[PDB]
Ligand binder design. Sequence first.
Ligand SMILES: Nc1ncnc2c1ncn2[C@@H]1O[C@H](COP(=O)(O)OP(=O)(O)OP(=O)(O)O)[C@@H](O)[C@H]1O
Ligand SMILES: [Mg+2]
Lengths: 172, 29, 210, 193, 125, 52, 52
Amino acid sequence: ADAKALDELRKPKFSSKYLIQHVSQKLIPAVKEWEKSYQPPVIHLGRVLSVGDGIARVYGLKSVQAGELVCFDSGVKGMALNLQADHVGVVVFGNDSVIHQGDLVYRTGQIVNVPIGPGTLGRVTDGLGQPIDGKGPLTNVRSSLVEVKAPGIIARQSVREPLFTGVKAVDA
Amino acid sequence: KALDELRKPKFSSKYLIQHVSQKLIPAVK
Amino acid sequence: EWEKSYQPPVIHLGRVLSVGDGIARVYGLKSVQAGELVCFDSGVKGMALNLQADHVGVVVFGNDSVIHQGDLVYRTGQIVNVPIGPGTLGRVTDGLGQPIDGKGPLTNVRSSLVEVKAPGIIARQSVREPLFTGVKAVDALVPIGRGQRELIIGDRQTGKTAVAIDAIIHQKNCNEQVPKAQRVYCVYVAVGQKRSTVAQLVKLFTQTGA
Amino acid sequence: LKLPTAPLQLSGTSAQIATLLWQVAAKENQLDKVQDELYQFIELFKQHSELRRLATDPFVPTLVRTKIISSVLKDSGASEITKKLFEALADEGALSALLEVTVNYEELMLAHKKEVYCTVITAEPLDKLERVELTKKAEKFVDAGFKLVMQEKIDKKLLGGFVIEFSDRRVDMSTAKKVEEFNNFVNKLVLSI
Amino acid sequence: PAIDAGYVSQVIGPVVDVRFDGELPSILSSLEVEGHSVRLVLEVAQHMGDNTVRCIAMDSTDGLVRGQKVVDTGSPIKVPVGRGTLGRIMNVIGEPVDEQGPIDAADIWSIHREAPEFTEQSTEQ
Amino acid sequence: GELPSILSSLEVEGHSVRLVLEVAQHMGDNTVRCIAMDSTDGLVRGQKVVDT
Amino acid sequence: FAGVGERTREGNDLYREMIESGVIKLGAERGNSKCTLVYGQMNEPPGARARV
Ligand SMILES: Nc1ncnc2c1ncn2[C@@H]1O[C@H](COP(=O)(O)OP(=O)(O)OP(=O)(O)O)[C@@H](O)[C@H]1O
Ligand SMILES: [Mg+2]
């Protein structure tokens, strides 16, 4: 059953078309009577195959980046951890009880972001940068990746200045 | 290649032939 | 007589399905034996260990970097063997008997299987004659007869090799004094050690004469 | 019951359906009506994307997937072996097993016309008598009432003789290896004297 | 340009699978990924079996898409060696990370080789 | 049809004691996995299960 | 000095202290250096730390 024997099945080798021509005129009438039972097909969007343990398996999402924010139609964010050949395993930033099998997964097009800036100063945010202090959205702010690589050897210098704790045992 | 979606099958049943044999055997005259 | 009795064997082939971590899964090789030497077309050998219904699992005697997907692996027809005989004395061989001391091929030697059935009840006799270790903590308290397996167990750097090396060195001192029939020929198998540690031992064994 | 013996013993769960498909098509003498009906369906998946959506898309309901397949195959004289197979593969969502059944249906079919393929590599191209003396060598390398076809290639790295390649074994009665098998025999024997 | 240029088939953290349409790279070969934000080389670890190699990323894989073109360099990771590399800082793939310009090299040796043989050892203390 | 949400309650139709299942995960292929709040002895494959 | 998976602060400390020691010379006197540094420190992904 090797691929040398399977890629011979690319080229046609039937030499008798009495069933190709028959069902090609009955297939499209057959599919047309079952259209309210088809979910619309999904290629660049996603559809949830399995959800449970706080991990969703998402069919589709043909052009997700590894480790980017996906958005379920429930409004929950996820992060595409492993892109597999057939599905995408996302980890759900929130409660997985609101994600169902069959739900649309939308792509945000960005690796996982938080709002950074001067306007995030003062605020109580959650693990994803969404504010929970109740005093509005974050303004005067911009998105930055949460998995930046640390600066290398040549981007650093020695530690020279003191950070005063105010704790007497510590700063002594 | 447009047939490359079907090259690798995976099944929902370990006992798939025990269902296939219950439909192919009564196709015999 | 060789040429008048000569047909070349059919060589059964196999394709490498997948390869990695020193294991090659092989399609085909339908007449390979369990525990048989195979030969990859990269020159590296292998041993067919688990013969599954769809593939053969082959452990690779060497570096698996030269094996690709779809490489041709041929069976050799033979269970794994090594050269035995007196021509192995004095030589440093590798795990399959090929000499690594750089002194040419093993002359005066004969290939025998490495997995032999151990001698049974009717082939034994009582262990009665002593093997002198030369280590007097051993030969007084825990003495060793000829035909007896004795464990040297301990932690690291507690002197387990030194008990073993002194058994080998002492046999050289005893072999110069006994008749030819009762002389002890040592074999030291060094598994998983450094190559520097092994080159220090053949330096000691050459200097002692062992 | 009593089914015919399949010529080959194969692997599982897609090669195991194909040897059952071969056995009910050997009972009904439909071993080549079922084979090209497989070959039509291989071509049917290439042209219709909604027919191969019934094999890859996991969100197609199983009541849809078995009713599109049955209502499309109800006519055009398909074998009852075929339209029972295809509703069985659509019941379980195993319609994507069909490239792998067709490959194993071929190997059972080619071992039923004992036709075994070959490749003979020689040094220079053959005579018409060098062809006839060679099959007399080569049908003693197939162990039944099998027929060899042949495929003739050349290699002057061989010094005469031939190499027969059967895609699962080769036999090298070329004299280029008979030199090396001679030399290593006398390079072993002068070291034994 | 079509064959010996595979595509990213699946990404699981540091481990990438690339599918090559023909002529798989050897195990320990280096593979460059085209279109990444940084230079991402992948060292081939395994041949998975269906024209797929399993390889290890020498940098981060956040950003890899499942169709991304992967070229094979036909050799392992080859780093600059010599007296020109003295006083420089290199990373895993031999790039200078000290901002002192390119490393002039006597040779570019692959980072994979065997041990010295048993005849090559020196027993002196 | 549509699956119950995770942590939804399911009641098994026709059983000696009221058997309540709580949906633990969506397994795929239109199956949910449930943990029972009572004994599952006497439960038959194909018994009707109502989503609350 | 192969730094495999250790602190990047320590890579900067050794590099700077080798420049003031004259073990590493920068600029046109680079050839009079005695040490070359290879660094795969603990911020690297596990493929880079497995090969450095
Ligand atoms: N009887 C002894 N008298 C003095 N020194 C000894 C003796 N035995 C061993 N040593 C010293 O102790 C060290 C450990 O010995 P040895 O190498 O034999 O231990 P080992 O059990 O082989 O350890 P490992 O194989 O774990 O390295 C050696 O350097 C040896 O020089
Ligand atoms: Mg030791």
